[PDB]
């Protein structure tokens, strides 16, 4: 029995210690992956993939990922990890590769070209593509998505983090999170070889361990890492875009083009 | 200021792989030994002969041995070098671009690019060009020379791109590409971009370049022999079209027939 996708919920816009131009990340949507290198922190996105977020939370709370491995890692591509097995406790999910575009959705359009989509921009701090009917998350670097088999509804336990942009995967995979801290540790993960079992790390060697995985909500509040994200629908966010397009430093005797790759735009995200 | 010399064409000596491949000359292979493993880089005197010669001189003088990747910003660049003033190594004239030659056999990428009107490949390197000039692209895993605001101030300290930094194109001397050990570059100790521009702070130190050598400094049978596919040949198109045309039923939404010039992998093999 494949688990059907539930209805999406827009991300909370609760004001934080910062101005009304920022939103609090809810603690249940913060995942802390502890590796020997340090902690990888991820913001989950139930606005695009509520079914996968719920599943991920369940597995994390159930300690299902503790001691598991990033068993498949290809440099410059993705770092993939999970239970590396089928478990009757965790049946497959319906794919959540895109969502209906809603009238309430406040997308900040990026007013320069993109190679893969006619329209790209930002929605609640996440990079997105959209058309008249649909919206989807972009496979920018540091995005969390669910691995699957050829049939779309086969994902549900094993995930990957993008090491570089993989835009060709857009609208074919369930993206349900983004890295907000510790991306450097993802980059330290033991690599496999793409020409050997598709990057699966081979015996006698094993991928680096997920020593523990928790939700911030599992910690007592006074130990919870408090994160806030700039609201990308505000005028203040444009600077984060115009700083990369308009480069006036005398360093440049050849003025750079007024263009920025949507996946290079950094959304202000701060620990509070 | 050391003036820039005339560019020199890359060797097209055929290898074990055949006439559609070229051997990389050992003098144009740099081996950076880290605690993680070896980073190998192919130098490009076709674009930056002056910087290549300088870099070769410093490597042979063992000037980089025991030095650090002292400035590293995740997703940006890993910068290393002597991190000091040295009278032995005066600044070089910038080599940020070269005249486009009719003899240049550029393989044009026939899809859009965000930063340049024409992009493609020249002797296994990503390039941009117009009517008059050609330049190397700041794709990931490219080696370039750090400098100050004045163009002719580079010459000792270099950086390796961790991700594409195309906005730097035509403003910096790019003079090499990583051909092996990119994963080790990604393991390098990081600094913090909001603290001294990513310079790693005491008591911590950047990871050490334990040794830096040219392959040519080794005896022939210990030299790593690398060959690169000639990008002007028809065989190279697959490396492009494999990523543009994805017909696998895995994709129920067929990807657009487009590839970022910096995502194209030029066949490069150890033999
Ligand atoms: Mg990139």
Numbering used by the authors:
A (entry chain E): 8 to 279
B (entry chain A): 9 to 279
Extract from the study:
However, AquaCyp300 elutes in SEC-MALS as a mixture of monomers (60%) and dimers (40%) when injected at a protein concentration of 1 mg/ml. AquaCyp300 is active as a PPIase as well, but it differs significantly from AquaCyp293 and human Cyp18. A moderate PPIase activity was observed only for the Leu-Pro containing peptide, pointing to pronounced substrate specificity for hydrophobic residues preceding proline. In contrast to AquaCyp293, AquaCyp300 differs from hCyp18 and EcCypB at six out of nine active site positions. The residues His54, Gln111, His126, which contribute to the PPIase activity of hCyp18 as well, are substituted by Tyr, Asp, Met, respectively, providing a plausible explanation for the low PPIase activity and high substrate specificity of AquaCyp300. In AquaCyp300, the first eight residues are not resolved in the crystal structure, presumably because they are mobile. In the AquaCyp300 crystal structure the six monomers are indeed arranged into three dimers. 50 residues form the AquaCyp300 dimer with an interface area of 1713.4 Å2 (12.9% of the molecule surface), placing the active sites of AquaCyp300 on opposing faces of the dimer. In particular, an extended hairpin structure enriched in hydrophobic residues (including three phenylalanines Phe258-Phe260) at the C-terminal extension interlocks the two monomers. To our knowledge AquaCyp300 is the first reported dimeric cyclophilin.
